[PDB]
Amino acid sequence: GLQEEFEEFAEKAKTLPDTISNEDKLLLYGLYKQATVGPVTTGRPGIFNLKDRYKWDAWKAVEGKSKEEAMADYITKVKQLLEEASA
């Protein structure tokens, strides 16, 4: 029941505060996509819209991970921030 857990933690994620470091947000994003959509197949955004480019980069950064592998780290990373958020 990994996917089961993943989907529950993808919600728990949204609960997290907006204040979390962008570095962390991007890692969650990259994993989330890689897990749900698999390796990026879109054009890398250009220099006008960093947010878009940075995201794309975060997803490209984890092109290697299998959907299962990706889910695993996603849940893990969420947990850190929940147990760290809770302090």
Curated annotation (Swiss-Prot):
Mind listing the GO biological process terms from this record? fatty acid metabolic process
**Any Pfam family the entry gives:** ACBP
SUPFAM superfamilies xrefs: Acyl-CoA binding protein (SSF47027)
Residues spanning the signal sequence: none
Q: Where in the cell is it found?
A: Cytoplasm, Cytosol
Keywords from the UniProt entry: Cytoplasm, Lipid-binding
The UniProt record describes its induction as: Down-regulated by cold stress, wounding and infection with the rice blast fungus Magnaporthe oryzae.
Q: Where is the ACB domain?
A: 2-87
Q: Which GO terms describe its molecular function?
A: fatty-acyl-CoA binding
Give the source's domain of life in one word.
Eukaryota
Q: Where does an acyl-CoA bind?
A: 14, 29-33, 51, 55, 74
User: What are the coiled-coil residue ranges?
Assistant: none
Expression by tissue: Highly expressed in leaves. Expressed at low levels in roots and seeds.
Q: What does this protein do?
A: Binds medium- and long-chain acyl-CoA esters with high affinity. Can interact in vitro with linolenoyl-CoA. Binds palmitoyl-CoA and linoleoyl-CoA in vitro. Binds phosphatidic acid (PA) and phosphatidylcholine (PC) in vitro. May play a role in the biosynthesis of phospholipids.
> What family is reported?
Belongs to the ACBP family.
What name does this protein carry?
Acyl-CoA-binding domain-containing protein 2
Q: Which organism is it from?
A: Oryza sativa subsp. japonica (Rice)
